[PDB]
Design a protein around this ligand. Structure first.
Ligand SMILES: O=C(N(CCCOc1ccccc1)Cc1ccns1)N1CCc2c(F)cccc21
Ligand SMILES: O=C(N(CCCOc1ccccc1)Cc1ccns1)N1CCc2c(F)cccc21
Lengths: 303, 302
């Protein structure tokens, strides 16, 4: 019993965090095998950030202009290249703590754990969702760039996010580990702003299934809905469209609980209309959208 | 920017988690040097749990009654003893990944990270507070017993909690690593209930200071209160009394924001009475009480 925002155990990632310095700029890098990955803006001054030409900034650098520290130990850089918005530093030592890993690009609505780091030293771990507007609602201060997001499956770490910047609303933007930004954002100080965000409907439905599994049914009703009528209503509350794919993904939870997906949809419609009337669902007074169907299954009793 | 419930990185503790089996009962243990710590109820059958005589149940056990698995590797048990409600198994191998550590007992209102584990295998990490009623609002299924709570300072792990049981309301109870329970609970399956809980006032005020630091300001006011009048309100709404010590601990945040604690109390006083006026504070439609003043400073300025 209980239901918590739970992160993956972070130890496999902790052993990969290093500090990268170029000039007066320090941030975090990810040391896997003999490569360190970090945001390419490490090669920029503050002045450079308005209109950087990364090709021109990088060609002026030699390997020894990059200082990489792994705990107490300096790693020697013996090569560098840029891939999209990520700098890849070849080092002369393979990380002996490299876990089984892959690089994955996630889609909006997917969750991951973030290891927030400063000066190559891990500070804290929390769970995030990729918002529909391609931002994350993290907790990051100056010095956090190059902190990573990940999932773990068996003993395999799937890296999906690297932190690059803060937007004016206090949310965060970054790239996959191939250096491609999530969303329309750029590693340039421009007037970019987060789009108006929306609620991740499939996740809210998963979390309502979690509430049922943990023994709460107060919010159900005697109605059903068509998928189209559900979407017409939900969109009036700035909820994401629910697709047939989402309905399919919810099948196992439907089966475990005996509540048809469109019957849970009718429940959600009524919750948006009514509020909670002084009640809570899994300890929350609002509808939670940062647990995926997978996350509910992961955490909840299968009974 | 941003404000998130954050756990400590768990790697130092991951390297200490093992599986302990006695008969048909399997749960998690903590392997530090050549000793494995786990709940003593591992020595019980389901029948024994109704009215266990732990003294007798342990005397009847030998080293050979215990299996300890560290990953793929069986550790041989070469000694056993009990300290309060914790079983200590001496093993033939010192854990090479033992961190610098201490055992500390925490106070209600204090926070810690939990590494939730099953079959000696870490599955997830989250942040908890020790509630005033000495329970924790965790997330634990069968097989989680022996999962631990901890804080980290520099390179030193301070272990403060070991999971023992679930209560009927779905909250959790356990011990410090010396086997002393938090709260008026016993390791027997008999009728037990969480006391009516109360809200950790100093933590709510800390979180209101966090909201101000993150530019959430709407609940500030000109109008203020006394400690006495505030505490009359606190008592009405099942909040813990606010002490002068609490007021002192919040001093940094008072200074940073220009908002006196008793002015923030009047804000909180209005929120408990008048409510939240449709609104949210840091994305919450409840008053959050599981961030300490230290946790806010740690995350906002660090
Ligand atoms: O948002 C930030 N910074 C760093 C600002 C200083 O950037 C620099 C950059 C280079 C040298 C010295 C200083 C503050 C953060 C808070 C929490 N997370 S990152 N950055 C860093 C990268 C970036 C962009 F490419 C575009 C817009 C903003 C930003
Ligand atoms: O709450 C639990 N259990 C385990 C029940 C099986 O206990 C046993 C114990 C021994 C042998 C066979 C079976 C369910 C949990 C859910 C989430 N966290 S623990 N326990 C185990 C210990 C305990 C007490 F000392 C007093 C009351 C309840 C419990």
């Amino acid at each position: 019993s209980g239901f918590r925002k739970m992160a993956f155990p972070s130890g496999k990632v902790e052993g990969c965090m290093v500090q990268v310095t170029c000039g007066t700029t320090t941030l975090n890098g990810l040391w896997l095998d003999d490569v360190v990955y970090c945001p390419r803006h490490v090669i920029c001054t503050s002045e450079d950030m308005l209109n950087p030409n990364y090709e021109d900034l990088l060609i002026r650098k030699s390997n020894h202009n990059f200082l990489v520290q792994a705990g107490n130990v300096q790693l020697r850089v013996i090569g560098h290249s840029m891939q999209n918005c990520v700098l890849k530093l070849k080092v002369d030592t393979a990380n002996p703590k490299t876990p089984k890993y892959k690089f994955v690009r996630i889609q909006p609505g997917q969750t991951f754990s973030v290891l927030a780091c400063y000066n190559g030293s891990p500070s804290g771990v929390y769970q995030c969702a990729m918002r529909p507007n391609f931002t994350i609602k993290g907790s990051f201060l100056n010095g956090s760039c190059g902190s990573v997001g990940f999932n773990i499956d068996y003993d395999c770490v799937s890296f999906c996010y690297m932190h690059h910047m803060e937007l004016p609303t206090g949310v965060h933007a970054g790239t996959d580990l191939e250096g491609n930004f999530y969303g329309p954002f750029v590693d340039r100080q421009t007037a970019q702003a987060a789009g108006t965000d929306t609620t991740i409907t499939v996740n809210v439905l998963a979390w309502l299934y979690a509430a049922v599994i943990n023994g709460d049914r107060w919010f159900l009703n005697r109605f059903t809905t068509t998928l189209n009528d559900f979407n017409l209503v939900a969109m009036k509350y700035n909820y994401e469209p629910l697709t047939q794919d989402h309905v399919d993904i919810l099948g196992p939870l439907s089966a475990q609980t005996g509540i048809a997906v469109l019957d849970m949809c009718a429940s959600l419609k009524e919750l948006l209309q009514n509020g909670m009337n002084g009640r809570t669902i899994l300890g929350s007074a609002l509808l939670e959208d940062e647990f995926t169907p997978f996350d509910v299954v992961r955490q909840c009793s299968g009974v």
